[PDB]
Amino acid sequence: MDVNPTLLFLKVPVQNAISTTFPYTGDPPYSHGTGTGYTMDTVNRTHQYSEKGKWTKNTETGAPQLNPIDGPLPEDNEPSGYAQTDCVLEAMAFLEESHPGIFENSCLETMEIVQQTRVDKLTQGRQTYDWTLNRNQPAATALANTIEIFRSNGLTANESGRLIDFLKDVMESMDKEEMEITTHKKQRLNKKSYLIRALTLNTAIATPGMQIRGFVYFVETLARSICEKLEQSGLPVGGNEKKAKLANVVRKMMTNSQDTELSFTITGDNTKWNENQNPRMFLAMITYITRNQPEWFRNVLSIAPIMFSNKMARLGRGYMFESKSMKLRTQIPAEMLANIDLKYFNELTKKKIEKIRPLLIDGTASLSPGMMMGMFNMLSTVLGVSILNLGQKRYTKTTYWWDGLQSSDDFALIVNAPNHEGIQAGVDRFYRTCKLVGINMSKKKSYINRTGTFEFTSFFYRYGFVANFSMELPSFGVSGINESADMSIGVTVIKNNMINNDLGPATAQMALQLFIKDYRYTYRCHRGDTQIQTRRSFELEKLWEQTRSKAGLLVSDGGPNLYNIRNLHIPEVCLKWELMDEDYQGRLCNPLNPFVMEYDAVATTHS
C-alpha cells in the first residue's frame, strides 16, 4: 500500500472531512508576505488599477494624487477602481428605501456614542505608528506620547478626557505652523513635515498613526451600527450566530423555489478588495448617510476618508544586498530608494522601483487611489450589502433576482431564476452592477453550483450542516501567572472555546488532558501516587499520606484532577470543597498566609 489521505474523499463528502485540508492550527513559523518589495508592489498595483484617473498635486502635502472616481467605464474583465459616484449614491439610496430609517437611527446612536466615549477607548487596540518616533509602539504608549507632545505645544483640550476633544486637539495640531517633539532629543517639524508624519501608514500590512485612529473609530462605529440592522451582512457577528445567517439565506431563496425556478449559489471572493475601494467614495457615502444631521456630526465623520484619500505610505525596512564573492551583507534603507542606482536589484524589483519613484515624497509614497487592509472593514461591508440589495426583484424589474451574504471580501450569492439563461443573466447583472462601485469579483477563486452547498468565510454549508473552521485552536498551555490562576484560565479557555469556536467533546477532553500534563510539569505537582521525583515530591508525598480524603486535594497539591466537560465552569477550590479535609481547608484558605472572564477563581495559599 501507498497511503493517500486525499483518497479518503472517495467515501466521505469533502465538506464532512474538510478539516483535513487545513494544514495549520496556529501561526506558522514563517513570514509570508512583507517588506519593502510587497509594499511597493501594492502601491504600484493600486495605482495601475486606476491609471486612467485624474492626476493632481496636493497643495499641502505636495505629492501626486490619482482620482479615478467617475473615470472611464471598464472595458475588460480586469480589476478597475473607477467607481461611479452616481451609482454608489443610487445604491445607497435604494438601500435606505428598502430599510427605512436605518441611516437615521444609526446616526442617532453613533451621535450618542460620540459625546461619551473616553480617550481611554483609543488605547484598547493593537500596534500603532508613533508620529513622534517614526516607529511602531503599543496603543497605550502611542497615545501617551501624543498627549504629552500635544500638551507641550499648548493643545490641552484632551484633558477633558472625551475622545472628541482629543480629535479637536488633533485638528488644531494640523493647523500649527511648527510642532516641537522633545523625546525622553530636541526636534522641530514644520507644518508640511508634521502633516506628512500624521498622514502616513507604517508596515493587515499597515497600521495608522494616532491622529487617524480617532476618526476611524467613530466611522467604524457608525458602520457597525448600520451593519447590525442588515441581515445580509455577516461581519459584526461570529460563532453560532453566524451559522444561523447561512441557513437563513438558503431558506429565504428556497421557500418556494420548486416551481422549476432553478437556484444557483456562487461561492465568491472579491479580487484586490482593498486596492479598489476609494476613500473618496467612502466620503461620498458618509455624506449620504449623515444627511439632515448636525453639521458637527457630519464634520467629525467625514474626516477619516479625507485623511485616507491624502494618506502616504512608508515603504518598509528596505532591501538587503549580498555579495557572495566578497562575503558581504549590507542593507539599504527604504529612504534611499529615491536615488540609489538601479543596477543592484533584479529585473522585477527594478521595474517596481522605477514605477514607484515618481510617487516618492519625503521617503514615503502617496497612496491616494485605494484603501489599505484592516481599516474601514465594516464600512466596506455596507457597500457590498447595498449591492446585494439591488437584486430584490423590485430593483431588477425582471425574472431573475439575486440575494445573498457578504462579509467584506467574502460572499455567497443565490441567483434564483426560471431557467439557465436566467441564471447566466442574473450573474452578469451582479458582476456588472458590482463593477460600477469599484468592487471586483474574482473569477479565479469563485464557482457556481446548484443551491444546497457552498462556503462563506470558512463556514462550509452542506444540505443544512454548517462546519465552522474560521478560527483556530487556542493555545492549551499554562498561562504562567501562578498555580491558582493558571488552572482557572486554562479550563476557562477550553469552555469558552467549546461554546464559541465549535470544539468536539472528545477533543475538548484531550485538550484538558494535555493542559493538565503541562500544568503538572511546570509547577512540580504530580499526583501523589505517581513516582516522579522532583524537588517538590517529598512534601507532596507526605501531604498525600496524611489526607484521608485524597480526592479533595487540589491539582496543585498533588491531588487528582476532577475536571470533565460538565464542570468546566466551576473553580477548582469550589469543585473540590465537600471532598477536602476540614483541617486541609483551614490550612489552604487561612487568611494568615505568608504567600498571598479572566482568572475567575477563589483565593488560596497558591497565589
Binding site: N248, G480, I481, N496, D502, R566, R587, C589, N593, T605
Partner: protein
C-alpha cells in the same frame, strides 16, 4: 514575552516565590528531610505545600457565603439531572396580543439561533451552554433546583431505574433484576425492606415491586404518561391494521366509552375514547413542546385510522439488547421522531368559545377559531396483583401490559444517600476506578472456592463472568497477550510443587479471563485504563492500583480497602517464586557468585538449567533459574 516559558524557568529555580517577611515566625527553615524552604523574602515552592501540610488551622465556614455565586453553581451542578443525548439533523389590526407573543417567539428562534434546541434561556441554562448544546447534538439537562427533600425516595428511584436498565440487557432479565434488588442497599437499609415499605409510584420501582410479587397500582403506563382509568370499561379485540408503507401490525384495539386521566411529568390531560376515536381531549401543559408530545402520545394511544395511515416510514425500532419492542411503542417512537405529517393529517375543525380553553395549534402556534379534532388546550389509587414475564413486562389478569422497561425514563440522576450495589453485573455503574476495587473484593470474599477451582478446574474459573467488567478496562490490543502470559505463570504454580503465593493469584487472576494468545514477551507491568489514564500493576511488587501490606495483611486497591488475606497451608516457604517469569523460577535473593545481573531482555538467551541474576524490578536483583520442563496451557 511568552509568560509560559518564563514561569517554567522560574519554577525551575530554587526560591522563586516572594513571600512576606514574617515567614520565619511561622514556617521552619528546613523540613524533615533537610530541604531548605526559604532564604534571604524568597521562598521555594516547597513552602506552599508545607503550609498546606502543617500550618495554622482556621475555621472556613464563611467561604460558602463570601463566594456564594460559585458554590451556588456547584450545588446546581451537583443536583443536576441529565437526560438523553439527542443527535439532531440540521436539515389598525386584530392580531391579538397572545398571537403576537407566539408568532414573535417562533420567529426569533428561526433567525436568532441556528441549532433547533428544545428550550432554555435563563442564566441557569446559559452557564452550562458548553454542555447543553454542540455542533449537531443536545444534552437535555434539568438544572439542580430545589425539588423536595426526600433523600430516600429519590435514591430508591435512581436505584430501581439503574437495576431495570441493567437487567433489560442481561441474558435473563427477571433473574438478574431479582439478584440485583436482593443485594443492593440504600442508606444502609436493604433495598427489599424499603421496597416493601415505600409507597412510591415510579415506573422502575413498581416493576421491581412486581418482581417481588408485591402489589402495585393498576394504572397503565405508556409513553411516559400514566393513564389512570376514571370511568368506563371494555375489552381488547387483538386485531390487525395496515400502515402507509403497507406493513401489517397486530395491535390490541379497545372499545367502549372510556375516561382516561393522563398524568405526566410536565403535562396533564383528560381523554375520552370509544372504539378507536378521540371523542374529547383536554390538555394542560407547561411548555409548547410538552403539550405537543402529550397530544402525540394521546393520538398514538387513540389507535385512530388517520393516525395509523399517517405513518410515512419503516416501523422498525430496536430496543437495547436488540429487541423489536411492540407495535404501539413502534408507532409512538416513529411519531415522536416526526410530527408535522401526523398533525396535518389528523384533521382540523372549528371551535366553540369555552371558559379558559384555547384551541390547539393546528401547527406551530395556537389558534382561537379552528383546532385539531376534539383536542383543546386548557388550564387548571388501588392495588391489583400482577405477573412479570421474562422481558420484565408487567401484566394484569386481563393480560394488558402495564409497565415495561420502555416506560422507565433515561433521566440519570445523582443519588442523594449512598447506594451500594453489592453484586456483579453492576460494578460498571460506578466509576471505572471502582471496578478494580469491587473485582478484587469479590475475588477475596470467595477465596476458598476460587482456590479450589483454580487448583482443580482452572479453565472454568478463567471463563467466569464476574471478571468481564475488569476486562473492559484492560487495553484491547494487548488484552489477550496478557492472558496467555498470566495463564502460563499459573500453570508453573501448579507444576512446580511447593510454590504457591495467594497474593500473586489474587493479583493476576482477573487478567486471565480473555481468549489467551501466546507470545515470547516477559511482561513487567500489566496496564489498565481508569478515567483516561493507564495505570500499571507490577507483576512482582506493589503498585498504587494494588498494594499488599504484610504487616496488617491487608489489600489496598487505588487507595480504598479490599480486605484481609490469610495464608494457605500449601504456601511455599523456600522463597521460590514461579509466577513472575514465563519460564523461570526466582530461586532467591542476589547471588554475586553467578556473575553480574542480566537485563530481562537478555535472559531469553539462557539455556535450560542455566542460572543467572537479573534486574527484575526497581533497583532490585534476584537469582533466576530456567526451567528445564516447559509448561503451557
Amino acid at each position: 514575552k511568552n509568560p509560559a516559558l518564563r514561569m517554567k524557568w522560574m519554577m525551575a529555580m530554587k526560591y522563586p516565590i516572594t513571600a512576606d517577611k514574617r515567614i520565619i515566625e511561622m514556617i521552619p527553615e528546613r523540613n524533615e528531610q533537610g530541604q531548605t524552604l526559604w532564604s534571604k523574602v524568597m521562598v521555594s515552592p516547597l513552602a506552599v505545600t508545607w503550609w498546606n501540610r502543617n500550618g495554622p488551622t482556621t475555621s472556613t465556614v464563611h467561604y460558602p457565603k463570601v463566594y456564594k455565586t460559585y458554590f451556588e453553581k456547584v450545588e446546581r451542578l451537583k443536583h443536576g439531572t441529565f437526560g438523553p443525548v439527542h443527535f439532531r439533523n440540521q436539515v389598525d389590526c386584530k392580531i391579538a396580543p397572545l398571537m403576537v407573543a407566539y408568532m414573535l417567539e417562533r420567529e426569533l428562534v428561526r433567525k436568532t439561533r441556528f441549532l433547533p434546541v428544545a428550550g432554555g434561556t435563563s442564566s441557569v441554562y446559559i452557564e452550562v451552554l458548553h454542555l447543553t448544546q454542540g455542533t449537531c447534538w443536545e444534552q437535555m439537562y434539568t438544572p439542580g433546583g430545589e425539588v423536595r427533600n426526600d433523600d430516600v425516595d429519590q435514591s430508591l428511584i435512581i436505584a430501581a431505574r439503574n437495576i431495570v436498565r441493567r437487567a433489560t440487557v442481561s441474558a435473563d432479565p427477571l433473574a438478574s433484576l431479582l439478584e440485583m434488588c436482593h443485594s443492593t442497599q440504600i442508606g444502609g437499609i436493604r433495598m427489599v425492606d424499603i421496597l416493601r415499605q415505600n409507597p412510591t409510584e415510579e415506573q422502575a420501582v413498581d416493576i421491581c415491586k412486581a418482581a417481588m410479587g408485591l402489589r402495585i397500582s393498576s394504572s397503565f403506563s405508556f409513553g411516559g404518561f400514566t393513564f389512570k382509568r376514571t370511568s368506563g370499561s371494555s375489552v381488547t379485540k387483538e386485531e390487525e391494521v395496515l400502515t402507509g408503507n403497507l406493513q401489517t401490525l397486530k395491535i390490541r384495539v379497545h372499545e367502549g366509552y372510556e375516561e382516561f386521566t393522563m398524568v405526566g411529568q410536565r403535562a396533564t390531560a383528560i381523554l375520552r375514547k370509544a372504539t378507536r376515536r378521540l371523542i374529547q381531549l383536554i390538555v394542560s401543559g407547561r411548555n409548547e413542546q410538552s403539550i405537543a408530545e402529550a397530544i402525540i402520545v394521546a393520538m398514538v394511544f387513540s389507535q385512530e385510522d388517520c393516525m395509523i395511515k399517517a405513518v410515512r416510514g419503516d416501523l422498525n425500532f430496536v430496543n437495547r439488547a436488540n429487541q423489536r419492542l411492540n407495535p404501539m411503542h413502534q408507532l409512538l417512537r416513529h411519531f415522536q421522531k416526526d410530527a408535522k405529517v401526523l398533525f396535518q393529517n389528523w384533521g382540523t375543525e372549528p371551535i366553540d368559545n369555552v371558559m379558559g380553553m384555547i384551541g390547539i395549534l393546528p401547527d406551530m402556534t395556537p389558534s382561537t377559531e379552528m383546532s385539531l379534532r376534539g383536542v383543546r388546550v386548557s388550564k387548571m389509587t388501588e392495588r391489583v396483583v400482577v405477573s412479570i414475564d421474562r422481558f420484565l413486562r408487567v401484566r394484569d389478569q386481563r393480560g394488558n401490559v402495564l409497565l415495561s422497561p420502555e416506560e422507565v425514563s433515561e433521566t440519570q440522576g445523582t443519588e442523594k444517600l449512598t447506594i451500594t450495589y453489592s453484586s456483579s453485573m453492576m460494578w460498571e455503574i460506578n466509576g471505572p476506578e471502582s471496578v478494580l476495587v469491587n473485582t478484587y473484593q469479590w475475588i477475596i470474599r470467595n477465596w476458598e472456592t476460587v482456590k479450589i477451582q483454580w487448583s482443580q478446574d482452572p479453565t472454568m474459573l478463567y471463563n467466569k463472568m464476574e471478571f468481564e467488567p475488569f476486562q473492559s478496562l484492560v487495553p484491547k490490543a494487548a488484552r489477550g497477550q496478557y492472558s496467555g502470559f498470566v495463564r502460563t505463570l499459573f500453570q508453573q504454580m501448579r507444576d512446580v510443587l511447593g510454590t504457591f503465593d495467594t497474593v500473586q493469584i489474587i493479583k493476576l487472576l482477573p487478567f486471565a479471563a480473555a481468549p489467551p494468545k501466546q507470545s515470547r514477551m516477559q511482561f513487567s507491568s500489566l496496564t489498565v485504563n481508569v478515567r483516561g489514564s493507564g495505570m500499571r500493576i507490577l507483576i512482582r511488587g506493589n503498585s498504587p492500583v494494588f498494594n499488599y501490606n504484610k504487616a496488617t495483611k491487608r489489600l489496598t486497591v487505588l487507595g480504598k480497602d479490599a480486605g484481609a488475606l490469610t495464608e494457605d497451608p500449601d504456601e511455599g516457604t523456600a522463597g521460590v517464586e514461579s509466577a513472575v517469569l514465563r519460564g523461570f523460577l526466582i530461586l532467591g535473593k542476589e547471588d554475586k557468585r553467578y556473575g553480574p545481573a542480566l537485563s530481562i531482555n537478555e535472559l531469553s538467551n539462557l539455556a535450560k538449567g542455566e542460572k543467572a541474576n537479573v534486574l527484575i524490578g526497581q533497583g532490585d536483583v534476584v537469582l533466576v533459574m530456567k526451567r528445564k520442563r516447559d509448561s503451557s496451557i
